[PDB]
């Protein structure tokens, strides 16, 4: 009952109950019904616990024939992983990368380069899909004149996914225009 | 010496010294050399103080003939405002908007619409420049195979601004392609 997977699941469950600020090892201990120094045998502190959480979320969702398809699905599965739990995005911030994740980075780069992306452009492209996705979820995860009214009605009805996808599409097409030779 | 501007300047200075997590009214009090309940007359708590900080940063930098120029400069001056202080980005998160800021939102929308953006696309465009910029600065503000090596050397030399601008440019051009009639 403090097998790794149970600690993690319990922590994730806690995150949804209390969010990132609320979550503390003391409470984790209490949830699991063990004494804090027992938990502490398994889990140094809060940073260590966030790190595993970030990784685990990514492992359930980061499960992803052209580069425009890879980019897009990539962004999507990342978005889903951050959405998966309360404050997922804040959680993911300032996580230190794993051995596999650098492997993957190398792969993605080898692939995009082998589609006649310069390495520079390879990086710029990942980077920017990266930032934009994170940017979106952070904001999605927070808390009288006419255009603003229509804009409430508008977003009331659609939520964040249609905008998010749009952006992403604009992004990748901006990249496509990059890809063609001069200017 | 606890005129509003001095409280704010002192707080900003503190933020750079200690960052967002470190900053506390207790320390603010101590810096200014006043007793905490005196400070407290002026400043309810930390959230209230963050809010003014966010606003003030924006007022120094958010000082911004086509829509591609407005979009781009807009993103830039926002980026600069978040960069202006340690953890600026984290600060800006979850700030509640001012009276002027809704005015401005209305304006920007009236403008873009009057360039034959549908309102939907107006929103999607601001939104996405918005997210992408925030996304970038958050990450800029944190803390063995060949392509990764070149990629270190690469980013060693350039820092975050060249990538950031690239993305932005891709973005706006993706939007341009949107703007043309069907498909």
């Amino acid at each position: 009952r403090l097998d790794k997977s149970k600690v993690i699941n319990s922590a994730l469950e806690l995150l949804n109950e209390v969010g990132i600020e609320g979550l503390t090892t003391r409470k984790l201990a209490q949830k699991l019904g063990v004494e804090q120094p027992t938990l502490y045998w398994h889990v140094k502190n809060k940073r260590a616990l966030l790190d595993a959480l970030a990784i685990e979320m990514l492992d359930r969702h980061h499960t992803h024939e052209s580069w425009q398809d890879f980019l897009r699905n990539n962004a999507k599965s990342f978005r889903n992983a951050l959405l998966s739990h309360r404050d997922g995005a804040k959680v993911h911030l300032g996580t230190r990368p794993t051995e596999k994740q650098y492997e993957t980075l190398e792969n993605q780069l080898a692939f995009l380069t082998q589609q006649g992306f310069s390495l520079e452009n390879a990086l710029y492209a990942l980077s920017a899909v990266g930032h934009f996705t994170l940017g979106s979820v952070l904001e999605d995860q927070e808390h009288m004149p006419p255009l603003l009214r229509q804009a409430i009605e508008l977003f009331d009805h659609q939520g964040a996914e249609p905008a998010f996808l749009h952006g992403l599409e604009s992004l990748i097409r901006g990249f496509e225009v990059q890809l063609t030779a001069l200017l | 010496r606890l005129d509003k501007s001095k409280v704010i300047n002192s707080a900003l200075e503190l933020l750079n010294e200690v960052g967002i997590e470190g900053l506390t009214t207790r320390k603010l009090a101590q810096k200014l050399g006043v007793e905490q309940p005196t400070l407290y007359w002026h400043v309810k708590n930390k959230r209230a103080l963050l809010d003014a900080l966010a606003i003030e940063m924006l007022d120094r930098h958010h000082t911004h003939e086509s829509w591609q120029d407005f979009l781009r400069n807009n993103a830039k001056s926002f980026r600069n405002a978040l960069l202006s202080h340690r953890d600026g980005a984290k600060v800006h998160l979850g700030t509640r908007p001012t009276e002027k800021q809704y005015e401005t939102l209305e304006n920007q929308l009236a403008f873009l619409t009057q360039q034959g953006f549908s309102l939907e696309n107006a929103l999607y465009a601001l939104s996405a420049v918005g997210h992408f910029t925030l996304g970038s600065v958050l990450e800029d503000q944190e803390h063995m195979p060949p392509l990764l090596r070149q990629a270190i050397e690469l980013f060693d030399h350039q820092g975050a601004e060249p990538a950031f601008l690239h993305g932005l440019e891709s973005l706006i051009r993706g939007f341009e392609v949107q703007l043309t009639a069907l498909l």
């Binding site: 993957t104 980075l105 990266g130 | 980013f155 060693d156």
Partner: peptide, 13 residues
């Protein structure tokens, strides 16, 4: 150096 930049990229992989 630009080390953290690459860390940041790997971190979302």
């Amino acid at each position: 150096e630009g080390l953290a930049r690459v860390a940041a990229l790997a971190r979302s992989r």
